Paper text:
SARS-CoV-2 has evolved variants with substitutions in the spike receptor-binding domain (RBD) that impact its affinity for ACE2 receptor and recognition by antibodies. These substitutions could also shape future evolution by modulating the effects of mutations at other sites—a phenomenon called epistasis. To investigate this possibility, we performed deep mutational scans to measure the effects on ACE2 binding of all single amino-acid mutations in the Wuhan-Hu-1, Alpha, Beta, Delta, and Eta variant RBDs. Some substitutions, most prominently N501Y, cause epistatic shifts in the effects of mutations at other sites.
We constructed comprehensive site-saturation mutagenesis libraries in the ancestral Wuhan-Hu-1 RBD (201 residues) and RBDs from four variants: Alpha (N501Y), Beta (K417N+E484K+N501Y), Delta (L452R+T478K) and Eta (E484K). To examine the structural basis for epistatic shifts in mutational effects, we examined ACE2-bound RBD crystal structures of the Wuhan-Hu-1 and Beta RBDs, including a newly determined crystal structure of the ACE2-bound Beta RBD (plus antibodies S304 and S309) at 2.45Å resolution. The Wuhan-Hu-1 structure features a stable polar contact network between ACE2 residues D38 and K353 and RBD residue Q498. The affinity-enhancing N501Y substitution present in Beta repositions K353ACE2 in an orientation that reinforces the D38ACE2 salt bridge but disrupts all Q498 contacts. In contrast, the affinity-decreasing Q498R mutation alone improves the coordination between residue 498 and D38ACE2 but leaves K353ACE2 incompletely satisfied. The co-occurrence of mutations at these three sites in SARS-CoV-2 variants may instead reflect antigenic selection for E484 and K417 mutants (which escape different classes of neutralizing antibodies), while N501Y might globally compensate for the affinity-decreasing effect of K417 mutations. Specifically, the set of mutations in the Omicron RBD are predicted to strongly impair ACE2 affinity based on their summed single-mutant effects in Wuhan-Hu-1 (left), but their summed single-mutant effects in the Beta background (which has N501Y) is about zero (right), consistent with the actual affinity of the Omicron RBD for ACE2.
Residue numbers in the entry:
A (entry chain M): 1 to 137, 141 to 221
B (entry chain S): 332 to 529
C (entry chain C): 1 to 230
D (entry chain N): 1 to 215
E (entry chain D): 1 to 214
F (entry chain F): 116 to 135, 140 to 575
The structure:
Amino acid sequence: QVQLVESGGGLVQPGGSLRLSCAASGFTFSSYDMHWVRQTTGKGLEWVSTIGTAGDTYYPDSVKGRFTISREDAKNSLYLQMNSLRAGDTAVYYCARGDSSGYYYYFDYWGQGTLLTVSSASTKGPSVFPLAPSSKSGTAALGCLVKDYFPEPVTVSWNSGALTSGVHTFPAVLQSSGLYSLSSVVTVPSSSLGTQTYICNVNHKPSNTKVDKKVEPK
Amino acid sequence: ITNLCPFGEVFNATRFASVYAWNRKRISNCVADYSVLYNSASFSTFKCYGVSPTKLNDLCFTNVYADSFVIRGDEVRQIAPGQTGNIADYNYKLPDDFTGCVIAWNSNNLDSKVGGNYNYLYRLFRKSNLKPFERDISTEIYQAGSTPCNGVKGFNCYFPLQSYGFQPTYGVGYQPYRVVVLSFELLHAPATVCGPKK
Amino acid sequence: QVQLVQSGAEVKKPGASVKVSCKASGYPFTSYGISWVRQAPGQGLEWMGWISTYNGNTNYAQKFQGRVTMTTDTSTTTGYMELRRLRSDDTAVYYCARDYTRGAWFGESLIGGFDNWGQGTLVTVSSASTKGPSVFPLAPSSKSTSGGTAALGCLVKDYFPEPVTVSWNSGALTSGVHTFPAVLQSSGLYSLSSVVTVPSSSLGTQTYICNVNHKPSNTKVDKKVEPKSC
Amino acid sequence: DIQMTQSPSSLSAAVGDRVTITCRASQSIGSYLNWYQQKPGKAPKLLIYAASSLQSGVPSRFSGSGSGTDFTLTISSLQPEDFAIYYCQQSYVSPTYTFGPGTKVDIKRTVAAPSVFIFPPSDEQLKSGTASVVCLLNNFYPREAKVQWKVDNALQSGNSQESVTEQDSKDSTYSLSSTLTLSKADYEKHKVYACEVTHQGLSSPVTKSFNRGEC
Amino acid sequence: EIVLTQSPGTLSLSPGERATLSCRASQTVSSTSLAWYQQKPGQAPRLLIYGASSRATGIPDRFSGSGSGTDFTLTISRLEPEDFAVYYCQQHDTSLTFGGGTKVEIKRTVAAPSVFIFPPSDEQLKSGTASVVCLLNNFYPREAKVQWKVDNALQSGNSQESVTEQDSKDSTYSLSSTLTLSKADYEKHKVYACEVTHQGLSSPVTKSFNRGEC
Amino acid sequence: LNTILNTMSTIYSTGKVCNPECLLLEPGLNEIMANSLDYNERLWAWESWRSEVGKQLRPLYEEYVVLKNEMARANHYEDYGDYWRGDYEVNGVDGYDYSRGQLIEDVEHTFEEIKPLYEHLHAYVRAKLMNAYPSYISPIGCLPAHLLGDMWGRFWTNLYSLTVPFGQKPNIDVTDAMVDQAWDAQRIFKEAEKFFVSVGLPNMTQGFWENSMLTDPGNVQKAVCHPTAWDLGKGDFRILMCTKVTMDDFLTAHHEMGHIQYDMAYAAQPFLLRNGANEGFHEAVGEIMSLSAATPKHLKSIGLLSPDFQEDNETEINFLLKQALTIVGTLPFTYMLEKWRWMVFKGEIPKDQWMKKWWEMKREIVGVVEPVPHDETYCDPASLFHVSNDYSFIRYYTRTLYQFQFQEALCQAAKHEGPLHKCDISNSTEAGQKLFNMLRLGKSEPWTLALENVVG
Ligand SMILES: *[C@@H]1O[C@H](CO)[C@@H](O[C@@H]2O[C@H](CO)[C@@H](O)[C@H](O)[C@H]2NC(C)=O)[C@H](O)[C@H]1NC(C)=O
Ligand SMILES: *[C@@H]1O[C@H](CO)[C@@H](O)[C@H](O)[C@H]1NC(C)=O
Ligand SMILES: *[C@@H]1O[C@H](CO)[C@@H](O)[C@H](O)[C@H]1NC(C)=O
Ligand SMILES: *[C@@H]1O[C@H](CO)[C@@H](O)[C@H](O)[C@H]1NC(C)=O
Ligand SMILES: [Cl-]
Ligand SMILES: [Cl-]
Ligand SMILES: [Cl-]
Ligand SMILES: [Cl-]
Ligand SMILES: [Cl-]
Ligand SMILES: [Cl-]
Ligand SMILES: [Cl-]
Ligand SMILES: [Cl-]
Ligand SMILES: [Cl-]
Ligand SMILES: [Zn+2]
């Protein structure tokens, strides 16, 4: 199975620099071109950079002089160094494999993306609170509130990922304070409230925050 | 084959043609190492059409043609299929199904001259747009009205070529850029130009 | 890795011809032309011509239009320069060089120069004939300053062709030595001098021998240089 | 470069319906056209290359047609898991590949009323000095819904924020959270906390409430 | 022909100084087609600059090329000891030609020559020729006047001079003057003198011998 | 007519009066009218210029009026004044047309609205001048023309020394802070470039930095040190400025670079449409830049004033008074001069009444009276450069009004709070966008539309 995994996104001040990594597995990495493609809500998908199999590198004009793509075939690794970062560079960055059938080129495999936030504001880690299941009730609802964190994103799982069915992790909301807040809920059989333990696992990498909160009926 | 294609002779020529009289070299029976073109600190434009640059050393073609000329920076965008403007219409026209690459770089330090270098010209008027890969080097007076010109410039009668008059203090949009167009030609004939990996 | 190795030195009589070879290595031979340049003793550089390794096209300096011929062999990646009807003033070092001024394929001018050069080939054109030098002493003065410095030497005269080599006490004496560039005498034979300054006190005790070697005639001479004897 | 345009901007269709999306290139690009699918929170997924070649492993209901400047992506029978944004991308000019702006494909389904839940603030948060009350509307359709907060039967304004999930890939419903934020002081001044929910799937508004100190 | 003129022929500077070398063409030369070469004694030339301003491989930053039209300049920002050599310009705008070259020598404080005179050896005289040698040792600058006199008669047309390369350590020159006479003339005359005029000498220095002196 | 024009130009430029030693208008008589506090000295210089030059110009000016009117009517204008007013005319664009007569109506309307402010400024200046020239000025009369701070009363600027409301409150001058921080001309121009980038406008071109002349070249070569912005075409933009490390030169750099930004914006227009929307647009664009740069907000922001610097009402009133002495002072002068010329061209003022009407208008419109009676042998308006050198003058009125129209619109887009004179448009891409939407037009659209793009 071809897999690509980006790393290194996060908060960085304007004018600052940051390196993104992409780890590849499941193919002969050296035999394929590699690419960086970024995504923003306002401008959609945008090509950021390309590296071929002959050391050749390609950049759009908006990026030449500021970003540098490179590759370490011995470590099946792809890199994007970024200097002179501006607020407008805030985006999700994907690495992507390029391949061709005949003359027709395409991006057949993409990573999961890593969010780069360019801001002068400071990191804050979330507080995680239980949303306790009602003593009154069948189907019951419970959850976790992840309040007052910056920048995006937080990731939330349940029972270390053993619980996925019925889970809704809501999109974050920007509060008037400039901080984000989010809540993850799950619906379960009421009867299971006394036969299953429910723990939410919240992770906020920019602040190195990992919290496991057990949600219990009061 | 063991001789390398003479890409350096094209890109590193001292003299470049005016765009209305664009130069063409035919490159055949050679191994093409395109790696000389990768990561140039000089190239301001490197685009390919129908093939990807990364794959160039894995391709074979019947012939490669190298057209070269000088224009201004603002006009480099016109050196591509589907474009319009003085250069695309009256000077150098690529086909809608072009297969090749276009490379360009600033030549202000070679082709400008204090006081003006008037050797670089471009066609400004033509009765019709050029067909792809057509070269017009006529100097017939352009007749803009019903009155014949009888070969003399005058009212509604214009000399068809105009000079760039490049000066080093010009802005970038007006500075000379050298351009090379490599066309990859694939006929029903054996391939004579191949990358080192084929 | 780029390397141009030229043929050995040559002696020719007036009107003879000379062919100098130039083995190229470490680069694609047929992508670059070969240029040739010459340098007469003590004079500037003088361009001779250019040849394409791809199609054999040539471009010669007007000065040699009817006397020079440039050729190449691809299998041996070698260039050749033949100069004919040799005159006295054709005496010079002849360099080949890898050319990036004119294109091998298309023969049009390139942004560049001569970027790699051979070690050169000395061609001596003279009606003279091989002759070993006579070695005479330049004896230190009887008027040398007591406690000061004296000068002595060897006159190496009437030899042909170049070069000779000169050492002192078989290489033990090097400080204070000046071996002068040879001059071409009106006879067509060369002559030079090697001198050295020594402590005057040394003349009574130390022996001073100049060792002269002229390989073209297989001549070797060791001359003891003595003071006074008046 | 080559500008890519897509039509429509968004579209609602039912499971089993034939969905048809179009792509236009600012100039002729022959068959150098790819189609990608992107689901919420996930990376693009290649569906079609060379205008009509179906990438390996892609379900056969996806198909691509077109040539020159106009191209079409067709879903022969829309499935719930196809809710997504579809992008085209020209492969004719490199390295400057360009993407279309995307077409959103939403699923039309039957009306589903929300399941409503209310959550009082945790004691730890109250120790921090702030109270968050959460109202959850679970798995409803269509997306239009109204929630109103009442504190001691006093309607609230300006102290709540809502968030809505993207359409569920299995049942095509939506879920919504509303968060009321109060100071610990304001929260301790009152007793009844309720959220009243209006949705087209309910014959009458549904209120879920709690008293401050009761369980 | 396009003639390149380089002036001065010899440029005398101290190490560490800036050096600007001039190449003036007899008609305009395209900047694409002017190059600069370095040459050290006994070595082949090396390409320094091509295209008027572009550096060749392995050429340090202190080397710079500039110019246009008919005026071109090779600049060495900080002279290292290894930079004292000859420099040639070259054009191939029209045919191909070299400049005459400029030598960059180490400028030194004035040093007067030590002068010596050597009479012919008896061995040589037995052969029918006499060589008289006058040695000017370790002097700067290079320019000097050497005059031979035989019984006060000023000699002309019968002497040859040779000069060493500038010394690596002293930055001085040495020079030899060899007067060639017939045995008959040498034995006919008595006083052999070489007179040396040089900037470091308060008055000209004469060295002489009288045939027979002990 | 060319002989007449050259003769008038030369008589103005070479005219000199000899002490009853000879003084030339620049610098001598101008120095007197700027700095002298002697009633008699000022009167002498004023009358001397009026007589030495105006009397000579009078007949030339009479002939000039006739010939210019023949030229104008041959081009189908009513007179030379109508000809000039053509420089605001717009036809063919429905909803944006502007007639040559409309200019008079609109100038007179806006001047009627300026009248109260000018009257009160006038009363204030008269009181202070009374304190400075005790016996010579009436407290209900017009102001003697030779006491107004320059040779004509065109600007009242040099009256600041005599009228400063709070003489113990120094003005803000960050020159010393610039020298203490080791500023150079480059730093000044880099800060101006930063200012324009902050509103979303582009950097200066590499060529600008390579080819401008931003300091005096010294004794090697002589240069014309008047600050000027150059648009050579072919993408070549430059500034010529013998910059000194001074606050005034900092602000002037901003002004001139505003000219450059204008030039760059409309460089994409056809050659003949590369200019301001009308004669007043360019200088207005320039002035609003210096307006924003000089504010205490901006100087604090760029580190030339300490963050602890406190403003105060008295210093602000000082600054506003000075600004008025120049800006508000010149408006009635400019309108009255051009009104006299318009009427002379139209033929409404007989030659026998030329000077009479002139001084009547000076008394009525601008509140200034002649110290010496002048008859129709004089020609006082031609004693000003613009009149004897055949330049229209209403451009100054129009540009001055446009300035604050622009600034109000941009400060609104920049969400500025408080009085308009304290406003700095830095970091406002909204205001930059509004301004660029006009700059980009050059002369391609009606100036009515150009103005609408900025101010609505
Ligand atoms: C044009 O000439 C330059 C040299 O002036 C060539 O650049 C050299 O290319 C080789 C191959 O990549 C390198 O090893 C050298 O280091 C390069 N030297 C310099 C100074 O850049 C260039 O390749 C030539 N152009 C073409 C198309 O071949
Ligand atoms: C303007 O120039 C500065 C020079 O340092 C640069 O940092 C900045 O990114 C440039 N901005 C624009 C819009 O050109
Ligand atoms: C404009 O913004 C920059 C960067 O945020 C800041 O340094 C500067 O002080 C600001 N100036 C003003 C007047 O807002
Ligand atoms: C200065 O002006 C402000 C704003 O109108 C006002 O509130 C304040 O009282 C004034 N101070 C003085 C001393 O006039
Ligand atoms: Cl073709
Ligand atoms: Cl050529
Ligand atoms: Cl070197
Ligand atoms: Cl040649
Ligand atoms: Cl030569
Ligand atoms: Cl100005
Ligand atoms: Cl212009
Ligand atoms: Cl007056
Ligand atoms: Cl004035
Ligand atoms: Zn101005």
